[PDB]
Structure formats: structure tokens, C-alpha cells
Amino acid sequence: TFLTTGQITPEEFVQAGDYLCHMFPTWKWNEESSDISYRDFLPKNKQFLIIRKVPCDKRAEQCIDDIDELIQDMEIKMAQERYYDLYIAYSTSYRVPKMYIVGFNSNGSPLSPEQMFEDISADYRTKTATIEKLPFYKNSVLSVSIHPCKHANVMKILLDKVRVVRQRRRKELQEEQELDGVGDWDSLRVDQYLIVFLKFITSVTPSIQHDYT
């Protein structure tokens, strides 16, 4: 399972994508366009996820329990202002999702690669972010991609930490029930994979508004 490896199959990528778009209407699957370079192991209308123009107020320089809370809650259900389009695509080399961000200034002018790195937290640059063309377009655009598995298997680490927290919380609860004599009075599914992935993304790009969470 994905909890053991921290990796998913294209089918699991689809479920997670659907869940993400269902819980956060702002996210959407790609439409079917002629300018897209389709991958056969994924339905044509579910190649990648996109969220448009997420605002960025400050640079990165200035700027686990939350995830669990958010996941639980969902189970219940310089000065320049910048805007970033965020793409989540599936990486076949690591069987993990991968994000691509494309920045713009208020006028809609694309920000250069160097400018976008100002929005990547210094603590994640070298082993997480690099410059590359969006891989899903025939005539592509430049962007900064954020990878979760080049060094540390981030998804794996995060999913484990989340389970540890839950196990502790569940046992601490039973212990408090015995202590208070009221003892006589949620698992992680692949659907929530991308939500954990976005938590990771939030640490990597701290100045990007949480309009995707």
C-alpha cells in the first residue's frame, strides 16, 4: 500500500486528484486540449491538476498536527504582489506526484526562473526545486518544479509522522478514558494523498497563499 512505500500508481493518482477537486472546488483536472502531450497510462481528462493565479504577497525570505487536523476535518465534511499557477502532475520515475509552479506579476507578465526561486524556501531549493519546462504541453513554458522524492522520500516520512500522531492520540484518548472512568460510556486512505502532498508544498513555498487549502 501507499502507506508502506509512500508511492502511488496512476490510478491512485486519479482517485486522490478527484478527492482533491471534490474537497477544494478551486482545483481542477486539465481540460482536453490539442496542446497537451497525453500519457496513455492516464485518462485523457485526468492527466494533471491545476489551480490558477494563487496570490503571493511576500517573498520566501521574509516568511504535522495541522495535516492530521485538516485530514480529520475533511473526513468530517520585495513588495511585488505575485500570482502563481500550480500544476500537479504524476512522475513515472518515482511514482509520486510532482508540482510545477509558474509565476506572474499583476500585469500577467511571466516571472523569470530566477524571480520564482525567491518564492522557494531556502531550506528546500537544492534537493527539491529546479527549473524545467511543463512536461505535459507540446510547446512548453518554463517553471519551477517541486519534487518530493529526490533525496528523502518526503511523502513516506509525512505519512508515517501522521500515523504516529494518530496512534499516540488514539492511545492517549483511551488512557484518559480509563483515568476519567468514562471508558464504559479514522484511517488514512489514498484519497487524502495529495492533501498531505500539499502540506509539503506549503513548507516549500511559504509565501504562496493557502487558497488551495
Swiss-Prot record:
Any one GO molecular-function label of the UniProt entry: Atg8-family ligase activity
Effect of T128A: Decreases ATG8-PE comjugation and autophagy
One GO term of the biological process aspect: piecemeal microautophagy of the nucleus
Modification after translation (UniProt): Acetylation regulates autophagy by controlling ATG8 interaction and lipidation. Deacetylated by histone deacetylase RPD3.
Region entry Handle region, spans: 153-192
InterPro entries named in the record: Atg3/Atg10 (IPR007135)
Induction of synthesis: Expression is increased during filamentous growth and controlled by the RSF2 transcription factor.
S-S bonds: none
Effect of C149A: Loss of interaction with ATG8 and defect in autophagy and Cvt pathway
The protein's assembly and partners: Monomer. Interacts with ATG8 through an intermediate thioester bond between Cys-149 and the C-terminal Gly of ATG8. Also interacts with the 40 amino acid C-terminal region of the E1-like ATG7 enzyme. Also interacts with the ATG12-ATG5 conjugate.
Record note on domains: The N-terminal region (residues 1-7) is involved in phosphatidylethanolamine-binding and is required for ATG8-PE conjugation.
Family: Belongs to the ATG3 family.
PANTHER family tied to this protein: UBIQUITIN-LIKE-CONJUGATING ENZYME ATG3
Full protein name: Autophagy-related protein 3
Annotated organism of origin: Saccharomyces cerevisiae (strain ATCC 204508 / S288c)
Lineage: Eukaryota, Fungi, Dikarya, Ascomycota, Saccharomycotina
